[model samples]
Target: VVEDEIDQYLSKQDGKIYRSRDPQLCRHGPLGKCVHCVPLEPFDEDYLNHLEPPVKHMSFHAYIRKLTGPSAITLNRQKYRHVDNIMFENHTVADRFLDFWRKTGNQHFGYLYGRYTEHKDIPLGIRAEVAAIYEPPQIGTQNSLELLEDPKAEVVDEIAAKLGLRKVGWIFTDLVSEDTRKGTVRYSRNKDTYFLSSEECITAGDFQNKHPNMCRLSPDGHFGSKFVTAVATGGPDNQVHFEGYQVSNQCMALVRDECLLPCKDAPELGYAKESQYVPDVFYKDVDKFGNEITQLARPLPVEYLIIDITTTFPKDPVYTFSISQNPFPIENRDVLGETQDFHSLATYLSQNTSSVFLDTISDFHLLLFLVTNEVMPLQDSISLLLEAVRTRNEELAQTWKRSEQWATIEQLCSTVGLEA
Candidate 1:
């Protein structure tokens, strides 16, 4: 519900009654306890040059390549193995095939953005031979082994005729288990490729077992059953080491050369150690964004993003992308007047969360709608938020919202050191 809706409901005089079930209510979101953590400085690249963030963290260099040291690389190769899995699940058999490719494109955008951030650290849309893994393979076939050896030999021969050495590099894997009770297990690194003209997946040798649930993918890039994750670009070796954190419900290693592996109880199959590790992998074709990708060889289809609101579950949910020759939207424009409700709602309230007893976001749903929409300017949002409280419930808005001396965005810019 928006602010006005909440205003109407709460002020209804005699509608319904409610009580907080727990005596202690932990407040959440930007206005809550962790308000100090929100990035107030805006996305500024000026801070890119320094090795470490002014506040503190990994270096831009360490972040992209070689995150964990040589000593830890052995430990992280296992982590990389940890990451490979189905990026997202499709309810239907075909959608399973489809989403893999779409996930690749998403990974391209995300990884490229990450890559671009690193690249641009020097100057303009600059160029530098920074080392890191950078490839996304995603096609499937019955013969997974065939796809792995040399993809251009079998998978992309016809369409990628000119694509001489298109090696099927991005080896995302899945584990197979004939018997969950048995200890020994081996994950298949089957060759998976997509043909350009046919739009068919060429994954060699697929499998399934009696224990359907147990036979599925294990962790690393840990996405699970309930969540339908979209993929993005990922080219690196694997995670080296990890630290456990409550939020992830598992260990989160530094975003290392590879993805993390899952909690496996399978029999004693070993992981790649430091000696067997590939220290680096990366590539970039300087996308000036003016090319039309007509083949699979020099794959440029990742640049375009297409969303289809399908009626039924998608089959193969393969990369829902296209090659864009024109470097802009069909028609770009911002929708207006989206901030009024937010301003009006917050104008009468404050950012502090005072009560652990009441979790009233829906009761105050309007506040969420306004802030999340991100339509209003930061200062304007601050002014309106504070002003509304004064106008409607100045004396009581702080108590109502349950915050800890929440400041407006203005004060945020003014007082909080806007550094990442």
Candidate 2:
């Protein structure tokens, strides 16, 4: 029932139902006034199923509507998919996430940072253009991974905020090579069984529920989420591909209410056991007799809670963070022996003096190092430096360089035998 910050910035639009005219339902003549002639909600199952490539699942909001009341279905209306596409600034973001899996056969996870932009691919669609991926501290294995709390999380967010970025989504790897010599991989996910396992779906639901997209049309003033989940898994020809998805609001509600549980033997099916009370959930499907049937979803199909999204890259990429080449070493990458320290900072700053000094110091990890290590005043020094980096303003850079924080960095660089 709590609100998220996303709503404040979202553009308001009056939601109207739309669907192709049915001649039978158009009995109201040319007036378009028949009750059956009313357009369906964008998230309507029929509308989604009628897409060029039919969507196999129901909308999350629809599920929320189903659970809302004595006639809850009527109350859970006015929801839509705020976002439709998941784009990366470039392949580098994905490569970094999957590299651990490729090199050591260990799964990896990273939180995506980016901003939302209007997507032209579909009607009123939104897109998340990921600028960077932040790998938090974690322990990974071939089968599963456990994330550790990041000590510098606040500092990282502060740096991202200075650069006009926010947490958009998350990506993870689930790869198993079939033949190392041929570079073939096992395709673990497919329509034949499942796309996202129950556990993964639940996780996606939890994340999306936390980051709800603001929708003025909804009764609750919130609709679906912009939080996406990117999976790097094997595809045809033993290849690796990235798949995008967002769990429906229905999944979110179930997970939030603790109604859906994962089965150990069958990862695809979500088990619904009574916590306080499990709603009368149902999904439609054709039986062996070729008749469509609606059955209670004691074991919910994950596909019903999944909204498939596509991933792409911009033709002419524009990075939110200006520092492009040889980006600073990411923090907490001890597994790769990449750490944020005085030595790393000095080396990064001194790498290329020919480059703009402000740009050289603009890297997120480097800024995090300075701020978390207390090498500068976060409010004054770090903020000014970030401003300079963002705008590339020479005047602001000059002011920042004259600050005591710059002198401290200089002293540290000298001590580390690198002049910046």
Candidate 3:
């Protein structure tokens, strides 16, 4: 009896009017149609029956990759370029320091005391005195002499300080230290410290009026002695790590340790890490998938809906390629208008024939009929949905602005399809 009533209602209304007798026939209804009048038996038996409750799926690999892909890559590339800048700055600092050292003997003192003095036949008293007076203080200790006795401890302290400063500067820096027994040890720091201090070092005039070259020979001068030897020894095998740390410290001090500020101020230049590129590709993947789905089956004339079936809503949720509904007195009018124009056209074609139509309207109408007819399998629909999302994803890669959300949606859609 119920089947007969449904068939009778469908028959009278199939082509003559664009209305469905079902109470749920409005756009918001199931299958984007009137559930009561439209034959929902197939949909109920095939799709809804098989649907499992939604479950959360998180992929650390994909997430990390996305975070590090485009944005991180760009950021790192810029970082590398800025690293070139840092290199040039370092060279400039070195040259200036060298010139200053030559003019005042700081480098000569730094190198000789720091390195060459090891081979000197001079007395321990003289070496100790020279080291005590002039060499730059070791990182953790108040005096540089501490470094002379305990190189490892002082080096660790020095690395920690440099890395800390680098992190503050918003640049990314890393250090790898080999502890024979402990294997390889690693640490990371950001480039935020680059702006902390100016590139120029102490001047010759400030250093006892002795030039760097002359300082090496001077009894009181060890700057050239210390630094030159340190240079000869190759201060750190990882120059990139050291330079990055130094620049980060300099930048941090200058920018007052504001990570986002540096990025905002020089958006094009700062935040030049690989992580920044993730958003675009992520979003584009979703967009592409959506486009592909539209190509495959077209959007039903009945309004597409995004279902939030979860018990709890996410703090920041994104709706990917879903239609929004308005709830007001005028809502019905809008719904009716769409149904009369698009839905009615669809129903008319479905009841009358099964021939394929290449025209846009025919394709669109067919999609609507498929949705209501319960002919389209849920898995197939999901596949199409994921395809559209993939297509959107491709389009997103062309520009930075669209990448973030687009890629996320692409991933989300793909995930949904897989789960479904």
| Cα RMSD (angstroms) for every candidate in the order listed | 26.6, 5.7, 37.5
Model 3 C-alpha lDDT per residue in residues 146-233, reported as the tens digit of each score: 1234323233223222211111111111223335364332232223322111111111111111222122223643312111111211
Point out the worst 10-residue segment of candidate 2 by lDDT.
69-78
CA displacement after TM-score superposition, residue 197 of candidate 2 (Å): 1.2
Candidate 2 pairs with clashing backbones: 17-39, 18-39, 60-249, 60-250, 69-72
Q: Distance (Å) between predicted and true CA of 35, model 3?
A: 61
Best model per lDDT: 2
- Candidate 1: C-alpha RMSD after superposition: 26.6
Give the best candidate by TM-score. Answer: 2
Instruction: Arrange candidates, best TM-score first.
Output: 2, 1, 3
Candidate 3 lands at a TM-score of 0.14
Candidate 2 local lDDT, 40-152, one digit each (tens): 54345666668776644433333333353222211121234546778888776666667667767788888888887766444445678888788888888989978898877
Candidate 1: which stretches are off by over 4 Å?
1-151, 154-420
Q: What TM-score, computed on C-alpha atoms, does each candidate reach?
A: 0.18, 0.79, 0.14
lDDT of 2 at 114: 84
